[PDB]
Every structure is written in structure tokens, then in C-alpha cells.
Amino acid sequence: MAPSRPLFQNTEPVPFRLTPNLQTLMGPLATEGIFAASVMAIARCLTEPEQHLEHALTLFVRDEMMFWFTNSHRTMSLTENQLRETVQANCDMIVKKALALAQTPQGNLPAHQTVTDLIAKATNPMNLALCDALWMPYL
């Protein structure tokens, strides 16, 4: 969570960790068949009715926000309206991220194109070289 505002932010060059060694271990055929399809399958299964993931994330987000406010030592009001507004905002953000992965393109494009775009972005050497030294972007 961002120390300035109560929001979810990763702020890293790549969306997730997929380095050359893991790709080689999986192989091209497996990476094309299993890895790409399973992410979309999970997203589609979870967000079938859109009014369930939010109900599941409500309490977790509430706890996270309360912890952030307590750590900042700046509650000073325990205002329920602010809590509700920010909790709803964070739940909406997470659900938007979940819904992005489970969308089928419009033209004659494959079913999982967003996942392939994410994989390309996460394997691009240009932005794979901007990670920290401890992250070990290589290997």
C-alpha cells in the first residue's frame, strides 16, 4: 500500500515474475498450452457473477485499511463515511483487475489476448533490466 495515500500500487517494471529460467523450465509448448490458459480459466471461474468477488474482498479490504490508518496514527475521526468510500474504491480496483483478464476480444482474435500481452510485457528485456539487484531479474 502506498505510504502517501491509502491505495493499492505495485509500481514495478513488470506485472509479475516470469524470468528466463522459469520460462525455459516450463518450455514453449507448456507455456502456450497450460500457463496461458489457466490464468484466464481462474479469472472466468471467479468473476462469473460480478457481485461475489466484491462481497468476498470487503472484509479483507476493511482490515487492511484499518491497519494502514492505525499505522499512520492519523485516524483522528473514525469517520465511517471515509472508510466506506475508500473500501469501495479499493474493491472496485481489484475487481477491475480481475475482470480485465477474463474478457474475450471482439474481432477474430484469440480468447486470451490480454494474458498474452501481459506475458510479453513481463518478458520484455527492456523493462526486465530495470529491476533491483536483489530481485535478480536474470535467472
Partner: peptide, 22 residues
Amino acid sequence: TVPFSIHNHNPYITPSPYVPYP
């Protein structure tokens, strides 16, 4: 390029880790 090779790239395919890069 190189027909019937699994290392070819295509905007609708993953890069494959046996080529320099697309």
C-alpha cells in the same frame, strides 16, 4: 520463417526462450 518450427513469433503467440527477441 523457418516453416514448421516452434520458435517462430507471431503477435498472437508467446516469444519462446530460444530466440534473441521479437
